[PDB]
Amino acid sequence: MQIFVKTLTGKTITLEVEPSDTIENVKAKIQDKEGIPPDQQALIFAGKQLEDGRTLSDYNIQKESTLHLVLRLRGG
Amino acid sequence: MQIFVKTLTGKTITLEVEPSDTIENVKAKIQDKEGIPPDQQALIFAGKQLEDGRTLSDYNIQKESTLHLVLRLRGG
Amino acid sequence: VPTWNGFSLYTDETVRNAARYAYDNYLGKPYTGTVEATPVNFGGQMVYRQHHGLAHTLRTMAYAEIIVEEARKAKLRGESLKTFADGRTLADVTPEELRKIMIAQAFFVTGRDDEESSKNYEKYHEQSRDAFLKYVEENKSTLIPDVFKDEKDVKFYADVIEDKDHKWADSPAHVLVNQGHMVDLVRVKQPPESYLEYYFSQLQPWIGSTATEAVFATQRQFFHATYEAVAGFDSENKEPHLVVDGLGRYVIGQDGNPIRELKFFSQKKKLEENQRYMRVDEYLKLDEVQKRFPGAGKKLDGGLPGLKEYQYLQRLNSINRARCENDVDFCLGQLQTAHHQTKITPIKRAFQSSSEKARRQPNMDEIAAARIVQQIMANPDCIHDDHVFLNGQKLEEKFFRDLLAKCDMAIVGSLLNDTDIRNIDTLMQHERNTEFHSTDAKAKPVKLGETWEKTIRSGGGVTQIKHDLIFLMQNDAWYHTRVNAIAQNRDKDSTFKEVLITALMTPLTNKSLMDTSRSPAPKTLFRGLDLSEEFKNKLINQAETIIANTTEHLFTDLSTEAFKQIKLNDFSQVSARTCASTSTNIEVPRTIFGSNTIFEILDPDGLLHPKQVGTHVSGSESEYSIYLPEDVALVPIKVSFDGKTGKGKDRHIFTLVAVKSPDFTPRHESGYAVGPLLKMQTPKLEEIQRLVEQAREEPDLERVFNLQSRVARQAKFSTESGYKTFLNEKVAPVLEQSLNGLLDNNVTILGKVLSAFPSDGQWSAFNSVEARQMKIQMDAIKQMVEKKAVLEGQILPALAQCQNALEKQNIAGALQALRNIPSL
Amino acid sequence: SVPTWNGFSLYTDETVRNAARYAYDNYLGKPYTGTVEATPVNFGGQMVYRQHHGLAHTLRTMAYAEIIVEEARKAKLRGESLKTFADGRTLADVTPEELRKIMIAQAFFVTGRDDEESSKNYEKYHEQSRDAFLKYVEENKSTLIPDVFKDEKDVKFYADVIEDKDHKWADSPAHVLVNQGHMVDLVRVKQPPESYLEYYFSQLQPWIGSTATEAVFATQRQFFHATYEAVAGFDSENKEPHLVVDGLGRYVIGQDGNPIREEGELKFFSQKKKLEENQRYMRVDEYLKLDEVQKRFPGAGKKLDGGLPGLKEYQYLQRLNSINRARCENDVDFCLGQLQTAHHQTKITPIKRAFQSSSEKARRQPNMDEIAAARIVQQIMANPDCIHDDHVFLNGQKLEEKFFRDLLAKCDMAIVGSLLNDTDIRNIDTLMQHERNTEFHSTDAKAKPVKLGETWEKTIRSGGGVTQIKHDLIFLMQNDAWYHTRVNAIAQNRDKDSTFKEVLITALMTPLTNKSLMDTSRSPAPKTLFRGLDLSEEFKNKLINQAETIIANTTEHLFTDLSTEAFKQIKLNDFSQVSARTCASTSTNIEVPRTIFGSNTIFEILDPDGLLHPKQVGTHVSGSESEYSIYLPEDVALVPIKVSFDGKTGKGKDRHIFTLVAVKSPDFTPRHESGYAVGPLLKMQTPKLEEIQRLVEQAREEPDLERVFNLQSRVARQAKFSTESGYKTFLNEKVAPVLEQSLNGLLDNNVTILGKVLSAFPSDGQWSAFNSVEARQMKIQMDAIKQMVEKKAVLEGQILPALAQCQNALEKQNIAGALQALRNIPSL
């Protein structure tokens, strides 16, 4: 299974994932590819933010789904 | 009917009366024979003071009964 | 022991006339014989028979009376007295029996032709009997059957007088006539100790030692009353003993012991070497003598106390001596007064004496009770149906019943004044329709204040009020029956108003009596009661127990037992706690009201303080009122059956003596009246309650917002330049700063926004209609801010500092907190 | 029956701007080759070759066509019936695709001019314009066809409009827009201005109606100002001769005061036809008062000022000769920028006209209830122990759920936030501890409950001082939907099934979050913010017709002010409450609502007057959400000015963009009754003056009269015996009277007796004379009696009357006498 996480800067990140993958380790694989630390990652699927600990199949993210990634950090 | 009222000074005063006769009734009568004015008179029968208004029949007084008369005045 | 009927030597007519006939026909006539025929003179009056005459004869009769009296007492105390053949005892002598005894005693010595006592006893007693029978036959008509049942009865007493065989122990008649004759022999023959012991020993078996002591103690008082010398007694006197029977002596051997077979010796018989006569001191100290005579170790003085020998001897020579020997009525009067006194002296002996005859001063609760009475009288508005409500305090039926039972209401009444008396009517008008109920249930209820106004009160000054109140008490039975029953705590189904009225009227009535009574106090008063059979029987028993344990004594003071029995049996409370009605005329209670119980109240020491009630013209009730002082007891001295009342009930007269002693004081727990009075003094402190209610008002920030909005509308829009600078600079900051200050309850901000308020002259720069209106709005907001700054910042802290100084008792510091207040 | 526009605009469309660029580059920027006014002109040193019929003119005609279609659509929505073309359509039915083609044609309408010759060579100039249009299409066939022009047939239609061989200026929407666009630009400073304005107004009026035509010509003057063209005044009482514009002629009034008509209708008179004695040209003021003119023109009796409001004549002229005039006539992007700004302002100026103006851009100052609300907030935070399951219990007052919903609804919670301090922020940790196990619920019912305080402790909070707490709290709101969905729904009073604690936390965190945003935000306030929402199809169509009704009744005007109707419809259809009462999340990047979150509803929020005070949320790095938070002020409305269909979301549902303008006015201020917070705050502060209550109960205490009475008994029994000399004398004469007077003073409550018995109590030196044990025992007892008398003497005779006098002075509000009463206490 492969999915795409699209960003605001314009990059399209392609990831090989399994349906049982967690959101933590989708963020971990996003980090290995583009070097964005997972603590700054907010991943959205069909308008819903994805939560660490739940799986890709929990959100019904299937083959060739597109996720959305925005940087979100505390101020200061 | 006749009754006699006895005094402390010794005299025994006989009165012709009839049971329907009140007490004022009686004093009045003692005032004419003895002319002791009514409001100095206190009448006692069998140890009980007899009161204005109520009748000779009310206090059980009867034929040849004995009444006692004391002079009772305010001081000063 | 049956109840005596009041028969007395000093009041029975038959016995006295028998004494007259004996005197007029024998005793007062000269002796016809040799021995002591010559008369002796006392103060100018002649006595023909000085030794065996009238005074001796009457004294023997008086001895027989008290011997029966003391024997009845001893029997009631449980003592065993000597029995006769038929099992009777001297205590069993009846009044009729004793009247026959004394009549024979009047003639026992009339048959004497002279003073010879050595012979012709047979002849002289024969003349005595002849004299007695001659009197009996002459007055046969009266004597029989009233005194003597028949002539066979007459011969028995004639036989006792004759004394053919000296059967001295045969009957009460023989004993009393013999012992009465012998008791008069105790005189000043020396040695006095030997004579007294002998005659004491002769009487003692018949009545017992306590009774025999009372007889011979009384005998000395009768001797004083009839002007006879009275000997002393010395238990260690050194004279030789005198064996009275046979006029002999007893002996102590050369050997140590007293000689006996104990052995009699003639005064003539000569004694062996250095043997000696037994002395009176050794006689009295012998065990057998001490066991029957309590004279050991005891001394009695001769003569009369407080008289020295030259005054005593002029007394013995007084003409009253011959009056006793020649005047039956005078000699009986001397004896009666002495007899009466011996009933009182043992009572006073048993209690702590007092020199104060007046009531004591008020205690704290009587003082507080009087204050509460004056305030109720002043404000009858306080009287409700259940309670009294006065000065925030509720006083119920129990409080007023406590006052009646614990306060001396006469003492309370002495703390009231004429204003309280004048206020009697305003209390009565407040109680116009309050119904009083006589304890007689058939009587109709009477409205208190209305009756008072239309039947009792006659106007006038405060003295007239007092007599009107005293009149209501004396005249209206619906009133005084309820009042007395409540006052003495023996009432049933009384209303609260009846209790309160009783509590208020009892001290006020006492004051009325005390201020009005003029006459000096009578010393004999009579009170009538209508007691149940069971209750009267209880009082008889209690009185008889007290009388039986009140005895004169020679050597053995039993005052502690009289104290114990009087406390156990006292019924003084029957006459206490209320204004008790009495009369100086026994016929007011006996005949007019027909009471079955009469208290003859003797007050010889003036302790009762009776107050005159009403008038005392002839035919009146001669009424006097007693409120018994807390330390006075009405101790019984005699109980007589007096016949039957008109309704056929038994009537008894109790003779009571008023005795005052700290021993009779009750002990109450204090506080019952002071406590409530202290509650009423509590201040309402209403202004301070309003200081705090006002110190808790929310500030009205509505109006500060109102002026903020009013300033804002004029502070957006103003073409005049200087007015808008002043509104935005000087007015709006003060209002915003004042709002937060009121909101925050911050004193620091409030005390300083005050300075920021613009002056009247700064406001006066602008003569606009709205600027003047705002100026008046600003001033009101300014006063509102200052009052809070002064309250919370100035006054409230000073109160707290003042209060805290008061809980440390730094009084001058508490004042200082108010005095020294700091500015802002 | 009016289809939603798609946002097509002259100012953002690229094809239209390209055609204008080519028109300038190849014709409008090159010198005239003819005779009439071919000489260039300079403005601030920059050459303009075609002053009248050049770039600026051509761009304005396109701008006219845009607003004409705009106002035609508004007029149709208001229910007006517009003039129809043969096919049944009106200008209101013009599509975006059609308007683009029309504008492209307009761009070339004048390119064929060789000079400013008017009448002489109409057809040559229009043929050359046509050929220029054909040349441009041919050179851009690949881009142009078929996307813009469907085929050569289509191109010839618009080429034919440019050529204008038969003057069929009412044949089609393209004919009317091209012809009217060209004519609207002729309203200028030629005299008499009233004749020109009335004429061109009458040409346009039948197609779009009077209201629309007023809007068009009012906007024209603004386009003239934006492009540095002179604007004439209008004087309905001008006595200059009227100009019959169609023919440049005159009307005449004869020997009687009558207009010369014909067998009626007014005789046209040539200007060179000089006439009869006593005959007259009809004045402007007479023409405009004609019944026929008043029924078709609302200008009678009215006046318009020329030039620019606020500029003196000498300054209007140096403005007209500024270098910006040459920039408008030579720079396509500058001139379109000038026109776009003027066009945008004409959508705002009518809105502000319909409401009370406001001067101050800042939030107002705190009101009585907001100050009290802040204080209650501070005290809850200070003592979280007051928080119960059902209520808050603080200082004797019970605050239930409705109290906190009322604060959420009536206080400006940003203002309330401005009244909080850094220790209130710091107490958030304390509050979260106390609420460690309080469970929050997302409005998403499938989401599981989240324990608020534990998640804050273990996940949100990152240590540090106050500023870090502020950023953490802002992060909680930005990041955690389980929290901000519940908070937002409660704050906007649209929640269902909330717990008391969710409401309370909403009421505490909303001002605390506002403070955190205000204290930390440093970014300059952006003026275009985007807000995404996911709305039901039913709800959005309500918003669409609400916004279209508002827009359709917001029009510029010349003589007839319809502000009252704009006020009515804006109050009827306002949906500002959708963005109110909460910390509303926005972004400067429309792609955050549109792409990341896939919203079907986007609010383009414009704040040109700086009324929203938005605050930066989080980080603004590349790839972030570029988030800002707004808490809408109570008197600011977000008024729609435009609705655009924007295509479909990821899930296939239509997406619309509502462009809202923030407008401040007292007419939007809500009416709330005061006291909702001040009421409970004041009750909390009522003082429990127990020190005064204790003072009262110390005046309650009773004297020990029994003790004084008993001491009398002892003094007497102490006296009855002589012991110390001559202390018996002392006892009977000095001690016994004093005790007698004391008791009598305390039996009554005679302060006057009690005061002077105080002086009668023996001195300590008097007692020094007696040294017995019972004498010393006695003074100790005597000192106790003196203390009892003194306490009653001072309280009853000094302190209590002073306090009563003080209070009576306070009751008459004479405060000086109040303090007098305390300070002026006289000694006994």
Curated annotation (Swiss-Prot), chains A, B:
Mod. after translation: Phosphorylated at Ser-65 by PINK1 during mitophagy. Phosphorylated ubiquitin specifically binds and activates parkin (PRKN), triggering mitophagy. Phosphorylation does not affect E1-mediated E2 charging of ubiquitin but affects discharging of E2 enzymes to form polyubiquitin chains. It also affects deubiquitination by deubiquitinase enzymes such as USP30. Mono-ADP-ribosylated at the C-terminus by PARP9, a component of the PPAR9-DTX3L complex. ADP-ribosylation requires processing by E1 and E2 enzymes and prevents ubiquitin conjugation to substrates such as histones.
Cross-link (Glycyl lysine isopeptide (Lys-Gly) (interchain with G-Cter in ubiquitin)), chain numbering: 6, 11, 27, 29, 33, 48, 63
Protein name, as recorded: Ubiquitin
Effect ascribed to mutating residue 74 to K: No effect on ADP-ribosylation
Effect listed in the UniProt record for changing residue 65 to D: Phosphomimetic mutant that binds and activates PRKN
Source lineage: Eukaryota, Metazoa, Chordata, Craniata, Vertebrata
Record note on what altering residue 75 to R/Q does: No effect on ubiquitination by CRL2(KLHDC3) E3 ligase complex. Impairs ubiquitination by CRL2(KLHDC10) E3 ligase complex
Function: Exists either covalently attached to another protein, or free (unanchored). When covalently bound, it is conjugated to target proteins via an isopeptide bond either as a monomer (monoubiquitin), a polymer linked via different Lys residues of the ubiquitin (polyubiquitin chains) or a linear polymer linked via the initiator Met of the ubiquitin (linear polyubiquitin chains).
Compartment(s): Cytoplasm; Nucleus; Mitochondrion outer membrane
Resulting phenotype, residue 76 to D: Impairs ubiquitination by CRL2(KLHDC3) and CRL2(KLHDC10) E3 ligase complex
Residues flagged as site, Interacts with activating enzyme: 54, 72
Species per Swiss-Prot/TrEMBL record: Homo sapiens
Known outcome of mutating residue 63 to R: Abolishes HLTF-mediated polyubiquitination of PCNA
Topology of the protein relative to the lipid bilayer: Peripheral membrane protein
Residue span relative to the full protein: 1 to 76 of 685
Substitution effect: residue 65 to A: Prevents phosphorylation in case of mitophagy. Decreased localization of PRKN to mitochondria
Residues the record lists as (Microbial infection) ADP-ribosylthreonine modifications: 66
Listed result of changing residue 48 to R: No effect on HLTF-mediated polyubiquitination of PCNA. Impairs ubiquitination by CRL2(KLHDC3) E3 ligase complex
Residue intervals of the Ubiquitin-like domain: 1-76
Outcome following mutation: residue 9 to D: Impairs ubiquitination by CRL2(KLHDC3) E3 ligase complex
Site (Essential for function): 68
Reported impact of residue 72 to A: Impairs ubiquitination by CRL2(KLHDC3) E3 ligase complex. Impairs ubiquitination by CRL2(KLHDC3) E3 ligase complex
Residue numbers carrying Phosphoserine: 65
